[PDB]
């Protein structure tokens, strides 16, 4: 909508207060005009019809319980946009400042969030397995990274290509969590998963087996469920990424860590220059090795650590 840019205030899913960019035109709308062609947050009103109604508020204050998922979806979309702009020189998910759209209050008791090819969608959770999923910055950045992948490598959502797709979203979801310095960790979804249980998460990059996900290619899932294990076999790639960044010994193979920033540069270059829709794990290794070579040299420690990491998880 056309109007005047301003700044409101509200509280997110976890009770924290934050300022959000809004637009005034009779109502105050969750429309951020400061980032690309805009960030727009919609109310799905517990229905499954999308996108719903652009979020409208009478006084530019968002402290109602109903408001919290919209505040965080709106705010964390902006943080993710800033990350890709400031760190990787990418303007929105298409590289041309495409508008970012999110709908909250999707359905009733829906324990998931997703990118649907055109926008982000967030359930509220059932209150036991999940609280509203936009409260997790790694969740939000995970979903928006699916849009980046769709517009770059185009990894198809099944088998090893799909597991790479999910791993990329976990990797940059975590890097965005570190970028915002919001209680950062190498876990996925810990802020919105099981509000009654402390210290757990949806999956772990540092130790995927902690939740029954493979940490080595010999333990990969080979069935047909989960589109061929896209959320399962991603643990193999997540572990390799964790090793590249932080280092460690895994199944007897030692990896010298090179840090998060270099991990992001290597995988972003692999994603945008070398991966294709049908890439498999072995091709991802070649892409990451070539990306590290482009950036740091064929004799560099960086290239060495990439090779060791994939060796450690059994990917040749």
Q: Which residues bind Zn ion (CB under 5 A)?
A: 166, 169
In the structure encoding, which two tokens stand for residue 73, read together?
A: 């979806």
Phi, then psi, of 5 in degrees rounded to 5: -70, 135
- Identify whether 37 is preceded by a cis peptide bond (ω within 30 of 0): no
From 74, 105, 231, 250, the catalytic residue: 231
Report if residue 316 touches Ca ion, rule: CB under 5 A.
no
Catalytic residue check, 160: no
Q: How far is the CB of 274 from Zn ion (least distance, A)?
A: 21
| Phi and psi at residue 186, to the nearest 5° | -105, 30
Which of 16, 57, 94, 226 binds Ca ion (CB under 5 A)? It is 57
Q: Please, which residue, 139 or 258, has the CB nearer to Zn ion?
A: 139
Contacts of 16 (CB under 8 A, 6+ apart): none
**Residue 94 is labelled as binding a ligand:** no
User: Which CB atom, from 231 or from 250, has the smaller least distance to Zn ion?
Assistant: 231
Count residues near Ca ion (CB under 5 A).
12
Nearer to Zn ion, 16 or 150 (CB): 150
Q: Are 287 and 152 in contact (CB under 8 A)?
A: no
Applying the rule CB under 5 A, the residues between 164 and 183 that interact with Ca ion are 177, 183
CA dihedral 180, 307, 232, 209 (to 10 degrees): -90
The H or E element that residue 57 is part of is strand 56-57
- β-partners of residue 25 are 27
Query: 143 catalytic, yes or no?
Result: yes
Which listed option, Zn ion, Ca ion, none, makes contact with residue 59 (CB within 5 to 8 Å by class)?
Ca ion
Classify the C-alpha dihedral 297-300-304-306 as positive or negative: negative
Query: Which residues in 115-144 contact Ca ion (CB under 5 A)?
Result: 138
Q: Pick what 226 binds: Ca ion, Zn ion, none; C-beta below 5 to 8 Å, kind-dependent.
A: none
Tell whether 183 is in a known binding site: yes
User: Which pair of structure tokens corresponds to residue 199?
Assistant: 């210290």
Nearer to Ca ion, 199 or 252 (CB): 199
Q: Report the alpha-carbon distance of residue 278 to residue 252 in Å, rounded.
A: 31
* Residues involved in catalysis: 143, 231
- Binding-site positions read 57, 59, 61, 138, 142, 146, 166, 177, 183, 185, 187, 190, 193-194, 197, 200
Q: Which residues bind Ca ion (CB under 5 A)?
A: 57, 59, 61, 138, 177, 183, 185, 187, 193-194, 197, 200
């Amino acid at each position: 909508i056309t109007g005047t840019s301003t700044v409101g205030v509200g509280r997110g899913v976890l009770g924290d207060q934050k300022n959000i960019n809004t637009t005034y035109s009779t109502y105050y709308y969750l429309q951020d005009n400061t980032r690309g062609n805009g960030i727009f947050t919609y109310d799905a009103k517990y229905r499954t019809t999308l996108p719903g109604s652009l979020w409208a508020d009478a006084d530019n204050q968002f402290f109602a319980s109903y408001d919290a998922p919209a505040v965080d979806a709106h705010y964390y979309a902006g943080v993710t946009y800033d990350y890709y702009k400031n760190v990787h020189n990418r303007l929105s998910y298409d590289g041309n400042n495409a508008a970012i759209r999110s709908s909250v209050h999707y359905s009733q008791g829906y324990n998931n969030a997703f990118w649907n090819g055109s926008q982000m969608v967030y359930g509220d959770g059932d209150g036991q397995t999940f609280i509203p999923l936009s409260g997790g910055i790694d969740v939000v950045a995970h979903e928006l990274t699916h849009a980046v992948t769709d517009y770059t490598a185009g990894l198809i959502y099944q088998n090893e290509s799909g597991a790479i797709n999910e791993a990329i979203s976990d990797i940059f979801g975590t890097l965005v969590e570190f970028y915002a310095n919001k209680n950062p960790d190498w876990e996925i979804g810990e802020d919105v998963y099981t509000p009654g249980i402390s210290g757990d998460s949806l999956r772990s990059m540092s130790d995927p087996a902690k939740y029954g996900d493979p940490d080595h290619y010999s333990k990969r899932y080979t069935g047909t469920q989960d589109n061929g294990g896209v959320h399962i076999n991603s643990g193999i790639i997540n572990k390799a990424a964790y090793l590249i960044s932080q280092g460690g010994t895994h199944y007897g193979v030692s990896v010298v860590g090179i840090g998060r920033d270099k991990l992001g540069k290597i995988f972003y270059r692999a994603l945008t220059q070398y991966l294709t829709p049908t890439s498999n794990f072995s091709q991802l290794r070649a892409a990451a090795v070539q990306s590290a070579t482009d950036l740091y040299g064929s004799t560099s420690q960086e290239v060495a650590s990439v090779k060791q990491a994939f060796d450690a998880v059994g990917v040749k």
